[PDB]
Each structure stands twice: as C-alpha cells, then as structure tokens.
Design a protein around this motif. Structure first.
Motif, PDB file in Angstrom:
ATOM      1  N   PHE A   1      -3.992   3.136   6.100  1.00  0.00           N
ATOM      2  CA  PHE A   1      -3.310   3.637   4.916  1.00  0.00           C
ATOM      3  C   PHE A   1      -4.256   3.954   3.768  1.00  0.00           C
ATOM      4  CE2 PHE A   1       1.282   2.348   5.721  1.00  0.00           C
ATOM      5  CZ  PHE A   1       1.716   3.657   5.645  1.00  0.00           C
TER       6      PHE A   1
ATOM      7  N   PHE B   1       0.793  -1.220   0.000  1.00  0.00           N
ATOM      8  CA  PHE B   1       0.000   0.000   0.000  1.00  0.00           C
ATOM      9  C   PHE B   1       0.830   1.277   0.000  1.00  0.00           C
ATOM     10  CE2 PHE B   1      -4.490  -1.163   0.665  1.00  0.00           C
ATOM     11  CZ  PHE B   1      -4.340  -2.528   0.762  1.00  0.00           C
ATOM     12  N   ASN B   2       2.136   1.198   0.249  1.00  0.00           N
ATOM     13  CA  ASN B   2       3.027   2.347   0.168  1.00  0.00           C
ATOM     14  C   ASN B   2       3.666   2.487  -1.203  1.00  0.00           C
ATOM     15  OD1 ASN B   2       5.942   3.733   1.660  1.00  0.00           O
ATOM     16  ND2 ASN B   2       3.864   4.581   1.806  1.00  0.00           N
TER      17      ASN B   2
HETATM   18  C1  LIG Z   1       4.248   5.926   2.162  1.00  0.00           C
HETATM   19  O1  LIG Z   1       5.424   5.937   2.979  1.00  0.00           O
HETATM   20  C2  LIG Z   1       5.904   7.254   3.282  1.00  0.00           C
HETATM   21  C3  LIG Z   1       7.211   7.084   4.020  1.00  0.00           C
HETATM   22  O2  LIG Z   1       7.870   8.330   4.204  1.00  0.00           O
HETATM   23  C4  LIG Z   1       4.850   8.000   4.091  1.00  0.00           C
HETATM   24  O3  LIG Z   1       5.308   9.321   4.353  1.00  0.00           O
HETATM   25  C5  LIG Z   1       3.539   8.048   3.318  1.00  0.00           C
HETATM   26  O4  LIG Z   1       2.525   8.632   4.125  1.00  0.00           O
HETATM   27  C6  LIG Z   1       3.104   6.646   2.891  1.00  0.00           C
HETATM   28  N1  LIG Z   1       1.913   6.719   2.058  1.00  0.00           N
HETATM   29  C7  LIG Z   1       1.148   5.664   1.757  1.00  0.00           C
HETATM   30  C8  LIG Z   1      -0.040   5.942   0.886  1.00  0.00           C
HETATM   31  O5  LIG Z   1       1.410   4.534   2.158  1.00  0.00           O
END
Ligand SMILES: *[C@@H]1O[C@H](CO)[C@@H](O)[C@H](O)[C@H]1NC(C)=O
Ligand SMILES: *[C@@H]1O[C@H](CO)[C@@H](O[C@@H]2O[C@H](CO)[C@@H](O)[C@H](O)[C@@H]2O)[C@H](O)[C@H]1NC(C)=O
Lengths: 48, 97
Positions: free
Chosen positions: A32, A3-4
């Motif tokens: 997330f 999801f990241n």
């Molecule tokens: C993805 O990971 C980053 C790590 O710095 C974080 O700042 C961000 O909020 C994350 N976003 C999602 C959609 O996972």
C-alpha cells in the motif's frame, strides 16, 4: 484501515491507533505504499 | 597517499541528490535496498560532484534508470539487471498497468 485513510490527522493532533488481537503480515503494509523512509530502529524490518 | 590497497574497486553511477546522502554503509531507501547496498564494514570513500552539463539538454533527457521494485533486498555489492514485472496480489500478470 490505517493506510487506506483519507484524513490522516495533522501532526499537532497525531492520530494514535492501537493494533491488537490480530496477525500482522507486513506485506499488506508494503503493497500500500511505495516507501521513501522505512528506517527501523528496534527491529530489523526484514525480521518482522 | 601513504596506504597500500591489495585491490581497488571504483563503482560509478549518476544518481539524484538525496540518494547521495542515501548512499552510505547501513542505510535504507529505494536505492540502498533495491539498487545498490554498501556492505557494513566498508573500507573506502564516496565521491559525488554535480553534473548538470552532461546529463541535461533542451527538450529533456531520460536515458538514466533506477529500480524501485525488487522481490527482495539487494545484497551488498551485487547487480540485479532484470526486467521482470513485479507481482502485486496473486496475479501471474506479465505486463504494465
Ligand atoms: C484505499 O481503498 C480503496 C478502496 O476502493 C482502494 O481503491 C485504494 O487503492 C486504497 N488506497 C490506499 C492508499 O490504501
Ligand atoms: C485514526 O484514523 C482511523 C482511520 O480513519 C480511525 O479508525 C477508524 O475510525 C472510524 C471513524 O472515523 C471508526 O468508525 C472505525 O471503526 C475505525 O476505528 C481512528 O479512530 C482514528 N483515531 C484517532 C485517535 O483519531
């Protein structure tokens, strides 16, 4: 890590990841994404 | 017009178009789970008509609200009027941002 991601593959080549040897707490799935369609079929999402 | 109902409840609320199809017995969504859940064995009807003349004006209008963040799902036929900052992570944070 699923999801990241930043380059979720196009549907024609659907990225398929395998999840094993892990403990699945779906609160990290809930935090997330402000969901729009969590339609679950085989299992009730609360009983996950 | 040829049935008899011990009692009749009429719940009225304006809502966006897609949520109209969202509103149904046994569904999901930010409204069907956190704002209004219809019990499974529901006996009745839903009514939806377009109102762009009473919910609109020049310069805009933002009077209507909805809940997209709740600690748990909304049980059938319950109201959850509350302004509590949703917890993310582990902070006892009480504020916006
Ligand atoms: C993805 O990971 C980053 C790590 O710095 C974080 O700042 C961000 O909020 C994350 N976003 C999602 C959609 O996972
Ligand atoms: C689907 O997308 C995932 C997130 O990008 C991939 O998982 C990661 O991929 C990186 C390389 O991009 C690896 O280094 C890392 O260990 C992790 O596996 C995943 O491979 C990808 N799968 C497919 C089939 O594209």
């Amino acid at each position: 890590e699923v999801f990241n991601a930043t380059r979720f593959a196009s549907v024609y080549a659907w990225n398929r990841t395998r999840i094993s040897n892990c403990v699945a707490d779906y609160s990290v799935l809930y935090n997330f994404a402000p969901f729009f369609a969590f339609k679950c079929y085989g299992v009730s999402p609360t009983k996950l | 017009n040829d049935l008899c109902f011990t009692n009749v409840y009429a719940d009225s609320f304006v809502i966006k178009g897609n949520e109209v199809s969202q509103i149904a017995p046994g569904q999901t969504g930010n409204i069907a789970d956190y704002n209004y859940k219809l019990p499974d064995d529901f006996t009745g009807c839903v009514i939806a008509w377009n109102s762009n003349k009473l919910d609109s004006k020049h310069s805009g209008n933002y009077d209507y609200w909805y809940r997209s963040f709740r600690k748990s799902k909304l049980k059938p036929f319950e109201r959850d009027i509350s302004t509590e900052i949703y917890q993310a992570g582990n902070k006892p944070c009480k504020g916006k941002g």
